[PDB]
Structure 1
């Protein structure tokens, strides 16, 4: 769920408020997403969007009524490392992995201020 993803991103980027810093960035970070990613951070978000689309194709996922944004899962942050839990069932586990991958991705790419609040004439 979005509460968990926020925490993951803070795990990797402890100075951030991710729901502010990483929402409405580029063509893909935030609601929806199309066009060409503007930079590597935007590409992290495209991958994550694709991961959530692939979570929904899962037979596993077609039961929790929640979407990936509302589907809770279990994870830990420890020493700024994210660990998804073996106690997660299949849908939960898949979404946790999508989120972990994206949080790590965000932490390893440049942040270009020019793309924050981009006009979706670029997308």
Structure 2
């Protein structure tokens, strides 16, 4: 769920308020998306959106209203490393992996302030 994703991003980027810094960025960082990613961070967000789409294709998520932004899962942050838990069931585990991969991706790409609150005519 969004709560866990926020904490994962803070795990990798301890100075951030992720729900501010990484929402309404580019064409993809925020709910849904369109167009061509404007930079590698936006591409991280495109991949994450795609991962949530793939998740929802799984029968294990379809059985539970396991909507990735609201589906709680278990993970830890320790020494700024994210670990998804073996106690997660299949849908939860898939979402946790999507979120972990995106958090790591965000932490390894430039953050370009010119792409914050981008005009969608760019998308």
Q: Determine if the TM-score, normalized by the shorter chain, exceeds 0.5.
A: yes
Report the Cα distance in structure 1 between the residues aligned to 2:62 and 2:48, rounded to whole angstroms: 19
Deviation of 1:31 after TM superposition, in Å, equals 1.1
| TM-score, normalization by structure 2 | 0.99
Match of 1:30 in 2: 30
CA contact (8 A) 1:73 1:93 kept: yes
Runs of 4+, deviation exceeding 2 Å: none
- The alignment of Structure 1 onto Structure 2 pairs a total of residues equal to 123
CA contact (8 A) 1:9 1:18 kept: yes
Tell me the SS of whatever aligns to 2:96: helix
| TM-score, normalization by structure 1 | 0.99
Deviation of 1:63 after TM superposition, in Å, equals 2.1
Unaligned runs of 5+ in 1: none
Tell me the SS of whatever aligns to 2:101: helix
Q: What CA RMSD, in Å, does the superposition of the two structures yield over aligned residues?
A: 0.5
Report the Cα distance in structure 1 between the residues aligned to 2:64 and 2:48, rounded to whole angstroms: 19
CA contact (8 A) 1:55 1:61 kept: yes
Report the Cα distance in structure 1 between the residues aligned to 2:75 and 2:102, rounded to whole angstroms: 14
CA contact (8 A) 1:74 1:85 kept: yes
